[PDB]
């Protein structure tokens, strides 16, 4: 018999997309969210990462567009911007400035609260979706361990009354994010511990919101400075992204060993000590609208429920709860869209439980691309904490992995054919392994390499919008 | 290490597509084929089924088009026809005539030798593909048994010289077809026996090519008769497809228990004893160009190498050899395209040996749709021989499967919304399980049902091109 009631824990991007998908296949869906969901673009404590710069890469943007047609146009009408890569960005890599080749990929950029609200407005309006705001999931009900175990429902607590209730379900979806209590819920059902890979470069983030020079959010590119050209030293990075309302979102980041700004008067000096001070020059006369927001959620971690024999029937885990990545590569929301898309494409085949386990295996395969990309890039940072069994990571020459990464970067910034393939991998539209293919290696040697840029490739009319001259 | 030499055993559609794919990722590929590959459309002993009706459904057509751009345009320029479903077909089901709704899917139809050569011409021209024509693979080399072995190469015979030769390889692809010798090659390295699911309704086929009335191949629909409305006696079917050169391809079919025309003067009598005699009335004044070609390759069979722990490294199996289906549903070439597309999509991720089995598991998952579709439809035929472990087949009440198949068919022929989803499953673009989805059940209840057609839905101008009335 088919499932008739599904419960989705968490109403952020992973839970909202899964709720919309499951409503097409299940008679009734209940969404359990700890926060009150605002009706206007507004931050909330359940998604504290929304304070920092967010790119929706073309992989997630297309997956969301095919699930919810019109979403992209609604975002743009609300002030979001479609950044073309590498065309609409002034980017400094460890190998030099990126030539602004005609765009081969894109990313939608906006405030994360606007993007969350726009998606919620297009997904949660179905008649068979019930949203229980200000309701907290406390534990799962059912049985675990041995064989034959299965999750029957979830205990929820109403936060305005304090009363608890048993919410029975044929299917429970954990989408509660990086701070998820899944390991406690599992152990309370007698389920053994899950396998977990971790690659933790100790990345932290400091963000301020600025009023951009008038017109810059439309006629000035995004700027990204990534300083990693030495490997015995921690990485230090910085981005300035345009968002709706004529505002600049500036996010500074560093790996373990470096020092982030903890006060407002340390923000611009950090940008002045990157490999090029262009982010400081842009933000020197810009009006700050916020204090400095911080984040320490920069580890790469992946659970493998698809490997656990004692995985209970009727339970799935998606989003940051299943796996989370270093935000610098900006794949979290695309991974959430992949989880919902995989449920949509595999649900009917997986029912008629071999279905719950088949869905979880399909979900695990869909999140491999953002995992192996972020972990490959972070594993070689100095003082990185590594605890993973992935043979693509652990059994690899460390000199050769670094040298090859440098060669990939050197080709992408100055070779059109190499840049196109790299943006495919960067946009999560091609696996990381494609950079080791015969196709990429032949493109890397055969393609032309343009001369090295000795200054940031701003067009003069872009410098005129922000009131600068000669880089 | 990244494979530097791959060998594909067998040409035809599975081998040709896989060879084109592997050439993108491996330095050199060898294609070893028993027959001489002709440079113009001609049948051959290695693919004797090419004499029978062949539809390239949109699933395989799109996968081939994305692999080999321009192939669809060359086929149409060479005389192939893009039949829209259900618009361009007059089809009689066990529930009645199919309303010719605007096309929601399509299939390319032409002679199989023409389609084969067109794909060969656009796939095997790469500089790093070497074709060993008139060369036969006899056995595999390597190790097997115990811990799980590994494949080193293949022994080949040159047929114009008579010489044997050892061809080592980092990766061997079996694309030999339904009569493939893989299970003996396995035992020859001591690899345990593979799991196999079989649903064999004993389907046989008789085909005669006719010269169609001038213009019929372009302005007249294909006709498909499925005489299937009783479950206690064998099914008998018949189709007439247009192909290039102004010719009609007529393929007659039956399941175990019935008798096909095995003599030429019984061919049209078989067509007049279908549930409607329209295919006989079409073929009585038609000029016969061939004798009747026969085939008894109508069983559904699936190997499960993805389940065998001791599967040797460096070996993959694709096409009809891995799994074959009842031709009546026409998914074999689309399944061959799926295996090649899956190899292309997963190859780089699978290397960087865990790769060969990762590729084989991905290939096995891609061939599930045509297997469960053909097996679900064939399992309940009278005197059908079943040897399978698939719980989607074994643990099903047969009344519930029979009743639902009738409701799916009755909805598809007279409800537009239901027809759209059914053609998606029929064209192999949606899994069979979609017909049990809440989405499909809601479409069946909510959508209108048009009145029953009491006559074949020919337009008056279509009857006039073939010279009939009513
Ligand atoms: C600094 C930073 C920058 C990032 N930048 C990007 C970027 O540029 N691009 C990108 O794609 N991704 C980015 N990410 C990742 C992205 O924010 C997440 O991947 C995305 O939010 C998906 O997470 P999720 O929906 O699974 O969980 P979350 O977004 O964390 O949401 C979890 C939800 O569950 C709720 N919840 C928690 N516990 C309970 C409970 N017990 N009961 C009920 N509800 C509960 C919470 O209130 C919340 O609504 C970034 C992350 C960080 C930290
Ligand atoms: C009557 C009938 C009708 C069909 N109709 C359709 C249809 O409408 N649509 C559709 O999509 N499919 C149809 N099929 C299925 C389709 O023919 C096959 O699925 C398709 O050809 C894929 O098979 P293959 O390439 O894997 O193997 P095959 O096409 O059988 O090719 C195997 C090749 O390997 C070669 N070979 C074999 N052994 C050796 C050896 N030892 N050494 C060297 N070379 C060797 C052979 O010479 C041959 O060239 C039909 C099949 C039949 C029987
Ligand atoms: C040197 C290196 O890291 O190579 C990869 C660099 C990339 C992929 C560009 C850097 C991207 C960012 C800093 C994103 C902005 C920050 C957040 C979304 C939190
Ligand atoms: Cl955060």
Chain A interface disruption, residue of B342, B359, B370, B433, most A CBs within 10 A: B433
What are the strands, taking DSSP E only, across A111-262?
Answer: 129-132, 135-143, 150-158, 164-168, 171-174, 196-200, 204-211, 222-227, 236-243, 247-254
Residues having CB within 6 Å of any atom of ligand 2 = B 9-15, 32-35, 46-47, 49, 52-55, 136-137, 175-178, 205, 295, 297, 319-321, 327, 330-334, 336
The values of phi and psi at residue A51, to 5°, are -70, -10
From the list A45, A7, A48, the residue with the least C-alpha distance to A28 is A7
DSSP string, B260-329: ---SGGGHHHHHHTSSSTHHHHHHSSSEE-S--EEE----EEEE-GGG-TTPPBTEEE-HHHHEE--GGG
What is the largest distance, in Å, between two alpha-carbon atoms of chain B? 70
Q: Which residues of A320-339 are buried (b: 16+ CB within 10 A; e: fewer)?
A: bbbbbbbbbbbbbbbbbbbb
**Could you tell me how many residues make up chain B?**
470
Q: Is A224's C-beta closer than 6 angstroms to any atom of ligand 3?
A: yes
A422 DSSP 8-state letter:
H
Tokens of A310: 């004692």
Distance from the B34 Cα atom to the nearest Cα atom in chain A, whole angstroms? 30
Numbered residues of the known binding site of A for FAD: 12-14, 33-34, 44, 49, 54-55, 112, 136-137, 320, 333
Q: Looking at the CA of A255, which ligand is closest?
A: 3
Distance, in Å, from the CA atom of A134 to the CA atom of A35, rounded to the nearest integer, reads 5
Judge: A348–B437 Cβ closer than 8 Å, yes or no: yes
Tokens of B185: 């090659």
Judge: B348–A433 Cβ closer than 8 Å, yes or no: yes
Q: Which residues of B247-271 are buried (b: 16+ CB within 10 A; e: fewer)?
A: bbbbbbbbbbebebbeeeeebbebb
Span from the CA of A236 to the centroid of ligand 3 (angstroms): 10
Q: Are B323 and B371 in contact (CB under 8 A)?
A: yes
Specify the residue for token string 């499932």.
Answer: A3
Q: Is A139's C-beta closer than 6 angstroms to any atom of ligand 1?
A: no
Q: Is A157 an 8 Å CB contact of chain B?
A: no
Torsion angle of C-alpha atoms A205, A207, A213, A215, degrees rounded to 10: 70
Strand partners, A92: A97, A225
Distance from the B350 Cα atom to the nearest Cα atom in chain A, whole angstroms? 9
Q: Is A284 an 8 Å CB contact of chain B?
A: no
Number of H helices, E strands in chain A: 17, 23
Name the B residues in 165-204 with CB < 8 Å from any A CB.
Answer: none
From the list B310, B308, B315, B322, the residue with the least C-alpha distance to B355 is B315
Strand partners, B166: B155
Using CA atoms, how far residue A51 sits from A331, A337, A372, in Å, is 16, 21, 26
Using CA atoms, how far residue B176 sits from A319, A411, B48, B101, in Å, is 43, 42, 13, 39
DSSP 3-state assignment of A236?
A: strand
Torsion angle of C-alpha atoms A222, A223, A228, A233, degrees rounded to 10: -120
Name the B residues in 381-410 with CB < 8 Å from any A CB.
Answer: 391-392
Residues 6+ apart with CB under 8 A from B355: none
Which residue of chain A comes nearest to B358, CA vs CA? Answer: A365
Cα distance between the two ends of chain B: 68
Q: Is B354 an 8 Å CB contact of chain A?
A: yes
Q: Are B241 and B279 in contact (CB under 8 A)?
A: no
Q: Is B206 an 8 Å CB contact of chain A?
A: no
Distance, in Å, from the CA atom of B52 to the CA atom of B43, rounded to the nearest integer, reads 11
What is the largest distance, in Å, between two alpha-carbon atoms of chain A? 69
Tokens of A356: 């719950």
B121 is in an annotated binding site: no
Contacts with A434 from chain B: Cβ below 8 Å: 348
Cα distance between the two ends of chain A: 66
Residues 6+ apart with CB under 8 A from A358: A346, A349, A350
Specify the residue for token string 């693919």.
Answer: B47
Task: Say what the resolution is, in angstroms.
Answer: 2.0
The values of phi and psi at residue B208, to 5°, are -135, 125
Distance, in Å, from the CA atom of A32 to the CA atom of A173, rounded to the nearest integer, reads 10
Span from the CA of A55 to the centroid of ligand 1 (angstroms): 13
CA angle, B242 as apex, B334 and B37 as ends, to 5°?
Answer: 55
Q: Where are the alpha helices (DSSP H) in B91-169?
A: 112-123
Residues 6+ apart with CB under 8 A from B7: B29, B30, B31, B32, B153, B154, B167, B169, B171, B172, B173
The values of phi and psi at residue B197, to 5°, are -100, 135
**Way it was determined:** X-ray
Distance from the A311 Cα atom to the nearest Cα atom in chain B, whole angstroms? 20
From the list A79, A45, A468, A127, the residue with the least C-alpha distance to A280 is A468
Residue A59's CB: how many other CB atoms inside 10 A?
A: 24
Strand partners, A302: A197, A323
Q: Given B348, B368, B439, which is nearest A437 (Cβ)? A: B348
DSSP string, B194-251: PPEEEEE---EEEEEEEEPPTTHHHHS-EEEEEE-S-SSS--EEEEEEEETTTEEEEE
Distance, in Å, from the CA atom of A270 to the CA atom of A406, rounded to the nearest integer, reads 25
Domains and CATH numbers, chain B: 5-54+114-197+298-373 (3.50.50.60), 204-295 (3.30.9.90)
From the list B164, B163, B142, the residue with the least C-alpha distance to B153 is B142
DSSP string, A79-116: T-EEEEETTTEEEEETTEEPP-PPPSEEEEE--HHHHH
The values of phi and psi at residue B345, to 5°, are -75, -25
Judge: B25–A349 Cβ closer than 8 Å, yes or no: no
Long-range contact list for A386-392, CB < 8 A, 24+ apart?
A386/A198, A386/A199, A386/A200, A387/A196, A387/A197, A387/A198, A388/A197, A388/A198, A388/A199, A389/A195, A389/A197, A390/A197, A391/B354, A392/B352
Distance, in Å, from the CA atom of A55 to the CA atom of A109, rounded to the nearest integer, reads 5
């Amino acid at each position: 018999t088919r499932p008739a009631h599904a419960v989705v824990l968490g109403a952020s991007m992973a839970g909202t997309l899964a709720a919309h998908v499951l409503a097409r296949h299940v008679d009734a869906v209940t969404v359990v969210e700890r926060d009150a969901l605002p009706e206007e673009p507004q931050h909330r404590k359940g998604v504290p990462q929304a304070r920092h710069a967010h790119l929706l890469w073309s992989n997630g943007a297309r997956l969301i567009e095919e699930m919810l047609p019109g979403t992209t146009d609604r975002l743009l009408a609300a002030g979001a911007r479609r950044l073309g890569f590498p065309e609409d960005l002034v980017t400094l890599t460890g190998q030099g400035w990126q030539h602004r080749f005609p765009a081969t990929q894109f990313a939608l950029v906006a405030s994360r609260p606007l993007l969350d609200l726009t998606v919620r407005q297009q997904a949660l309006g179905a008649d068979n979706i019930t949203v229980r705001q200000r309701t907290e999931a406390v534990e799962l009900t059912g049985s675990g361990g041995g064989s034959g175990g299965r999750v029957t429902g979830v205990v929820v607590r109403d936060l305005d009354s304090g009363r608890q209730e048993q919410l029975e379900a044929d299917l429970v979806i954990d989408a509660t994010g990086r701070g998820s209590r899944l390991k406690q819920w599992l152990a309370a059902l007698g389920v053994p511990a899950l396998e977990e890979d971790v690659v933790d470069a100790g990345v932290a983030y400091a963000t301020r919101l600025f009023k951009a020079p008038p017109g810059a959010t439309t006629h000035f590119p995004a700027v990204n400075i990534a300083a990693d050209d030495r490997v015995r030293e921690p990485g230090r990075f910085g981005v300035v992204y345009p968002i709706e309302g004529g505002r600049w979102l500036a996010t500074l980041s560093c790996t373990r060993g470096a020092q982030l700004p903890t006060h407002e008067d340390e923000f611009i000096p950090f940008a002045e000590n990157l490999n090029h001070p262009i982010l400081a020059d842009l933000l020197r006369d810009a009006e700050p609208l916020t204090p400095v927001f911080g984040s320490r959620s920069g580890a790469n971690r992946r659970l493998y429920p698809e490997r656990l024999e004692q995985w209970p029937d009727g339970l799935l885990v998606i989003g940051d709860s299943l796996t989370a990545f270093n935000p610098i590569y900006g794949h979290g929301m695309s991974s959430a869209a992949r989880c919902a898309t995989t449920i949509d494409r595999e649900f009917e085949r997986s029912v008629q439980r071999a279905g719950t386990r088949a869905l979880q295996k399909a979900i695990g395969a869909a999140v491999d691309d953002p995992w192996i990309l972020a972990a490959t890039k972070d594993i070689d940072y100095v003082n990185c904490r590594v605890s993973a069994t992935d043979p693509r990571l652990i059994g690899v020459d460390t000199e050769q992995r670094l040298r090859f990464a440098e060669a990939i970067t050197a080709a992408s910034i100055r070779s059109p054919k190499a840049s196109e393939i790299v943006t495919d991998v960067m946009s999560l539209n091609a696996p990381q392994a494609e950079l080791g293919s015969n196709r990429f290696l032949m493109a890397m040697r055969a393609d032309e390499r343009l001369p090295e840029l000795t200054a940031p490739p701003f067009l003069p009319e872009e410098l005129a919008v922000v009131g600068l001259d000669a880089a």
